[PDB]
Amino acid sequence: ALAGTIIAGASLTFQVLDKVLEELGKVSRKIAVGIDNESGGTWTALNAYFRSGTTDVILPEFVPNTKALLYSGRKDTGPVATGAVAAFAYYMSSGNTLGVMFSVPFDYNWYSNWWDVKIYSGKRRADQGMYEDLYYGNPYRGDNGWHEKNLGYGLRMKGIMTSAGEAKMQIKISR
Ligand SMILES: C[N+](C)(C)CCOP(=O)(O)O
């Protein structure tokens, strides 16, 4: 497939991400994630914690500089009113952890899509704690808009997440 795989950073596109959503099949709530690594060094998968939903693939174990990782997620199958929400992390060659969060609620009635990235000192794994850290911190909304910011440690991040049941999220970490 495409998810659980890495590709040349330069080739990461919305087209690539939408094709990821396709392989997930007709499921009302899903997300396809793409992260381009341009930090200067390699990344190593730590883990993924799902608040809601689940995933069908593995976190690309290795992400070398200039390469982009591909990942996906979705709500639980069946008559269950739930979305796709989680946080996952990658260990960096600088010795710090990169943390990512995405939330795609079941009922877009009251709720919306939310996401964020953050770098944790040392080595930390994704948990209900990191999830709450990014969710209830100051996450970006999946407003189909691009956002950027300084990640500290001299990295900077550029990103975007769509606002809908079948979402796509594209991020980039530069040095
Ligand atoms: C919508 N959600 C239940 C997945 C996230 C938590 O929302 P809230 O209980 O803080 O308002």
Curated annotation (Swiss-Prot):
Question: Which residues hold phosphocholine?
Answer: S52, V85, S103, P105, Y131, Y135, Y136
Instruction: From the UniProt entry, list the residue stretches annotated as the region N-terminal region.
Output: 9-28
Q: Name one GO biological process term.
A: monoatomic cation transport
The signal peptide, as residue positions, is none
**Partners and quaternary state?**
Octamer or nonamer in membranes. Monomer in the soluble state. Originally described as forming tetramer in the presence of a lipidic interface.
Instruction: Describe the function of this protein.
Output: Pore-forming protein that forms cations-selective hydrophilic pores of around 1 nm and causes cardiac stimulation and cytolysis. Pore formation is a multi-step process that involves specific recognition of membrane sphingomyelin (but neither cholesterol nor phosphatidylcholine) using aromatic rich region and adjacent phosphocholine (POC) binding site, firm binding to the membrane (mainly driven by hydrophobic interactions) accompanied by the transfer of the N-terminal region to the lipid-water interface and finally pore formation after oligomerization of monomers.
Q: Which GO terms describe its molecular function?
A: channel activity; identical protein binding; toxin activity
Give the positions of the site Important in the initial contact with the lipid membrane: W110, Y111
Mutating Y111N: effect? Reduction of hemolytic activity
Q: Which GO terms describe its cellular component?
A: extracellular region; nematocyst; other organism cell membrane; pore complex
The annotated region (Trp-rich region, which is important for the binding to lipid membrane) lies at: 103-118
- For the keyword Secreted, the answer is yes
Q: Which PANTHER family match?
A: BRYOPORIN
The family note in this entry says: Belongs to the actinoporin family. Sea anemone subfamily.
The Swiss-Prot or TrEMBL note on domains reads: Composed of a long N-terminal alpha-helix and a core region rich in beta-sheet structures. Before the pore formation, the alpha-helix binds the lipid membrane, partitions into the lipid-water interface and stabilizes the monomeric molecule on the membrane. Finally, it traverses the bilayer, thus forming the transmembrane pore.
Tissue specificity as recorded in UniProt: Expressed in tentacles and mesenteric filaments.
Task: From the UniProt entry, list the residue stretches annotated as the region Plays an important role in the hemolytic activity.
Answer: 1-10
- Subcellular localization, as worded in the UniProt entry: Secreted; Nematocyst; Target cell membrane
The principal localisation class reads secreted
Superkingdom: Eukaryota
Query: Which cysteines are cross-linked by disulfides?
Result: none
Keywords tagged on the record: Cytolysis, Ion transport, Membrane, Nematocyst, Secreted, Target cell membrane, Target membrane, Toxin, Transmembrane, Transport
**InterPro entries, alphabetized:** Actinoporin_PFT, Anemon_actinoporin-like, Cytolysin/lectin
Q: Give residue numbers for sequence motif Cell attachment site, crucial for protein stability.
A: 141-143
Q: What is this protein called?
A: DELTA-stichotoxin-She4b
